[PDB]
């Protein structure tokens, strides 16, 4: 839980699954807060939920580029999510 945020499981009928997160996705940011470790993510989700933020942008990574397209510039991974209600004990739905 102090390892890099590498998604393993995708919880069924959850936010993460509905907005379409796949196994292997590496979340690097949320709104904001730099995500390096799982701790930073947990903290950020709670902060945002109590801040009253209902929706925000989740940035991740998926796969390596094709050869001769290493240095290519494109949108990182703009993906808008609903923030889980921590009061109602709601989860995002990801686990290593």
């Amino acid at each position, epitope marked *: 839980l102090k390892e890099p945020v590498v998604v393993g499981y995708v919880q069924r009928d959850s936010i993460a699954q509905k907005i379409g997160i796949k196994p292997g996705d590496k979340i690097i940011k949320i709104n904001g807060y730099e995500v390096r470790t799982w701790e930073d993510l947990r903290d950020a989700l709670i902060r945002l939920s109590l801040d009253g933020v209902k929706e925000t942008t989740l940035f991740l990574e998926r*796969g*390596v*580029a*094709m*050869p*001769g*397209a*290493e*240095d*290519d510039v494109v949108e990182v991974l703009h993906l808008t999510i609903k923030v889980p209600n921590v009061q109602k004990g709601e989860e995002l739905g990801i686990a290593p």
Partner: antibody
Amino acid sequence: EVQLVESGGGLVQPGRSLKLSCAASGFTFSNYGMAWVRQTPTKGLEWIASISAGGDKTYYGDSVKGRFSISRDNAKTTHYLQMDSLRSEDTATYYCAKTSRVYFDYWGQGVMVTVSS
Amino acid sequence: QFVLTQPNSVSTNLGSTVKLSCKRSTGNIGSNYVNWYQQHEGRSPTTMIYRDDKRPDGVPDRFSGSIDRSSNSALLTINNVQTEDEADYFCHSYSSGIVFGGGTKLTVLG
């Protein structure tokens, strides 16, 4: 206005030099890497060469024996494919392409290259 | 390192659905992205599907891409097939190099 225009193709004798051009326009040239793909009647699509956006590295196909060399000229927003030691197998339609990280988003019209005596 | 396998030709009726297959030889299908290109007889290839399943706004909705993990293959589903689909459909992926498919050649009966 995304366009990729090929040129410099036609006819050449086996084991000789020929340089293909591919002028690009209507997008930041130095932001995206370039490529080349040929299409014969039989083989179909078959990747040849790819340069990076920064032009730090170049990549080639397995059906080339390090004979061709891919360059780019950001000044004229053009990229080139020099070809040496050609053969009758190399006779194909040569499309140039534009990369977008994980695929070829745009292709050119293609130019005919024929190797014969 | 790997290669892809496509049907040399396929046929379908006007209004029918069709599944064009693309089977990988070695490696995990999902680890490296898979893309799909249409090409009419004597035309430049155009993007049907990229990043596995993502369709570029412009291509009809009836087209769709998928990743069948069981067969280590990619598939292209075309609902309510039209006459304008009379074209070759190549699949594409990469790793250390860049690979294309054999070339599926769709025909439209009716």
